[PDB]
Amino acid sequence: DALRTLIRLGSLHTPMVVRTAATLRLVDHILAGARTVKALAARTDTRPEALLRLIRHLVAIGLLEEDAPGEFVPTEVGELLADDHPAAQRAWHDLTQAVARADISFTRLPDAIRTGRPTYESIYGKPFYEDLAGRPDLRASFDSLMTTREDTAFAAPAAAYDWTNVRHVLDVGGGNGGFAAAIARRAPHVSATVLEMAGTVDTARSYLKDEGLSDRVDVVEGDFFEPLPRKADAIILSFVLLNWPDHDAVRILTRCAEALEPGGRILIHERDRFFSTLLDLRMLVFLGGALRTREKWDGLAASAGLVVEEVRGPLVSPNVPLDSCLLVLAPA
Amino acid sequence: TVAARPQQIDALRTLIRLGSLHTPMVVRTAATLRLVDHILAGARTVKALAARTDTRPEALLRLIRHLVAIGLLEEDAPGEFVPTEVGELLADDHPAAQRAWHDLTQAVARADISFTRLPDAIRTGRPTYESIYGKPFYEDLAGRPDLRASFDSLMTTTAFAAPARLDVVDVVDFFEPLRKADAIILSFVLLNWPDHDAVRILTRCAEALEILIHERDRFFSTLLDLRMLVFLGGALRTREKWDGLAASAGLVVEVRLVPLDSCLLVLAPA
Ligand SMILES: CC[C@@]1(O)C[C@H](O)c2c(cc3c(c2O)C(=O)c2c(O)cccc2C3=O)[C@H]1C(=O)OC
Ligand SMILES: Nc1ncnc2c1ncn2[C@@H]1O[C@H](CSCC[C@H](N)C(=O)O)[C@@H](O)[C@H]1O
Ligand SMILES: Nc1ncnc2c1ncn2[C@@H]1O[C@H](CSCC[C@H](N)C(=O)O)[C@@H](O)[C@H]1O
Numbered sequence: 001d002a003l004r005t006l007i008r009l010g011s012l013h014t015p016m017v018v019r020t021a022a023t024l025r026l027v028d029h030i031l032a033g034a035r036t037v038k039a040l041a042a043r044t045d046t047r048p049e050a051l052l053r054l055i056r057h058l059v060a061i062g063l064l065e066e067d068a069p070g071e072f073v074p075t076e077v078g079e080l081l082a083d084d085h086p087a088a089q090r091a092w093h094d095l096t097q098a099v100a101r102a103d104i105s106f107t108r109l110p111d112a113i114r115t116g117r118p119t120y121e122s123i124y125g126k127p128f129y130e131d132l133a134g135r136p137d138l139r140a141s142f143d144s145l146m147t148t149r150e151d152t153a154f155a156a157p158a159a160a161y162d163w164t165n166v167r168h169v170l171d172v173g174g175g176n177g178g179f180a181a182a183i184a185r186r187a188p189h190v191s192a193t194v195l196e197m198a199g200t201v202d203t204a205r206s207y208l209k210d211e212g213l214s215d216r217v218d219v220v221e222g223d224f225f226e227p228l229p230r231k232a233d234a235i236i237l238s239f240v241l242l243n244w245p246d247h248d249a250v251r252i253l254t255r256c257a258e259a260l261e262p263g264g265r266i267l268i269h270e271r272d273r274f275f276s277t278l279l280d281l282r283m284l285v286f287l288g289g290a291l292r293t294r295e296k297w298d299g300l301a302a303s304a305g306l307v308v309e310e311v312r313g314p315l316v317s318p319n320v321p322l323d324s325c326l327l328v329l330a331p332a
Numbered sequence: 333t334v335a336a337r338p339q340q341i342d343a344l345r346t347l348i349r350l351g352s353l354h355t356p357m358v359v360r361t362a363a364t365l366r367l368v369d370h371i372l373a374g375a376r377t378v379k380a381l382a383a384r385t386d387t388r389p390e391a392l393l394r395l396i397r398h399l400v401a402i403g404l405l406e407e408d409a410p411g412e413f414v415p416t417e418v419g420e421l422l423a424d425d426h427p428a429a430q431r432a433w434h435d436l437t438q439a440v441a442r443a444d445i446s447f448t449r450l451p452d453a454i455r456t457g458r459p460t461y462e463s464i465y466g467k468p469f470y471e472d473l474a475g476r477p478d479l480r481a482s483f484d485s486l487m488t489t490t491a492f493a494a495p496a497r498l499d500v501v502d503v504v505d506f507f508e509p510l511r512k513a514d515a516i517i518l519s520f521v522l523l524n525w526p527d528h529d530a531v532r533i534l535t536r537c538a539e540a541l542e543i544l545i546h547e548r549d550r551f552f553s554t555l556l557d558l559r560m561l562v563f564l565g566g567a568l569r570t571r572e573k574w575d576g577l578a579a580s581a582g583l584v585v586e587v588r589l590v591p592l593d594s595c596l597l598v599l600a601p602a
Binding site: 002006009015016017019024045046050053057059060063077089093095106107109110112113153155273274275276278280281284316317318 | 334348349350358359388395397404430436445453457549551557561
């Protein structure tokens, strides 16, 4: 059982069988009628001999089942690869989309452990966010992926804070505007600014406009290593700082400290050890970032001239197998 | 607001485990760095292990976290990590040679990178190995003597072999005219080849006879077969496919065994 258990752990073919299936929209095509190999091969544009060899392992791991002879149907776990499923797992495993494409960086993990440095650029030619800035399909795909992680609703992180005395929110690296939008639905008196990159600002405005939230949340295109576009009572950093090594993280925290109004707060929204280490090693090979322990957080806070006032407890979100925290940061 | 449904979370966790590239690459990185050997040699602190492996200590520790999470390393004493029961199989002296199997510097774990382009293999039926490394699998080994050495040594667990009433006394391209013999042995050979190369090999064997093929949970049958797709364009084959191949070579199957089970197909001239 040890030799068997280690070979399953060490197996590279099972993950890429799952990822090949997601990229081919296999489960979509089955659910739309193509239950046999010959029909599925034509829908996916694959060699019929080759599909069957892929399907065999899909059956052997319990994502596919055989109902009638020759006819394949997804199981309960395999249904999560339907494109419309609310956890978006198909797109998370779609090698044409930005995250599963970034996971190829894991094939150079030894380099990342030897150096502490990301392996993405050594595969694709440019660092992560610079690659997206020249690949609008990947920029859009990454933004859509980050939004679905809270059912695009971000209800749990926005409930974890009291917005009574907050006039303006600046969502720094706020993505497509989901967190800003969630605060505005909860606190009708607050207005908000989303600071994001080229490409993402457009999809953020569309999303915010399509929420009827255009009158209350606006979107600025800029670089958060530079002076922030305005001041605010609540500055949001939501899955931003784990993208960055300690020195860049402090730089970002400092720009936010400079932009705080008197009495205002910086809010860090960030993080099953299997899933904790997945995100942490992703940050290594993608970007050179990391997850940080509470003690490391005090250290980074102090380098930016801030204190961790409190850490508001597990926020459970749908579609994410992993909880998160909200860190409230006070100027020292 | 949020609705958390445990049956769907359990299902989501299952699919993400199945789909994750980090667990296999963490095991392969550990095997490539000889982590378990170094631990067994008395390096239990992260600082020593990083020195022996020439990795940054912060990064090594994050690798260890996942090795702990998946059960290959137990923490035991604060800051001193030890192999578990499963972890001990990464020891270099272990007879299953799993460490050599997962070492990215050896031939097979290096070839396993071909799995990163599985869609190309499924779309086309052609191997992806030469698209990543530049040479088809065996051309690559012919120009890389340490990889030809690693593979030959992996397979025990041509001139580049010879440890020392036929099997293709010791004697040195079975695509060339082969001595003769009363039984020729093709053991885990023909799965390495497309159907036409397999027929060629079987043909030469037929021309020297006065033929037994030794080849084949399903997770391990599909691993070997999908490896043969992305590495070489070979495949595991069914009784029906073996008959069509025997016929193309002038032969007839006259199909006989206990991680993976094997079979014996004795072939006679038609
Ligand atoms: C561990 C059990 C076993 O060794 C059983 C069997 O012996 C076998 C395996 C692997 C390979 C070959 C085998 O024959 C093989 O022939 C081959 C080849 O010709 C050319 C390239 C790679 C391989 C290759 O990776 C192993 C397996 O099936 O699962 C890991
Ligand atoms: N230099 C920079 N200036 C502004 N935004 C940046 C930036 N570098 C990265 N970002 C943005 O930081 C974001 C991190 S992903 C986090 C998105 C969103 N806040 C959420 O929680 O879902 C990306 O969308 C990226 O565009
Ligand atoms: N054109 C060729 N002629 C002869 N041998 C070849 C070949 N191409 C590959 N091989 C060898 O065939 C082997 C398949 S694996 C070993 C097969 C079996 N154990 C045996 O004893 O023969 C590999 O070691 C590979 O080096």
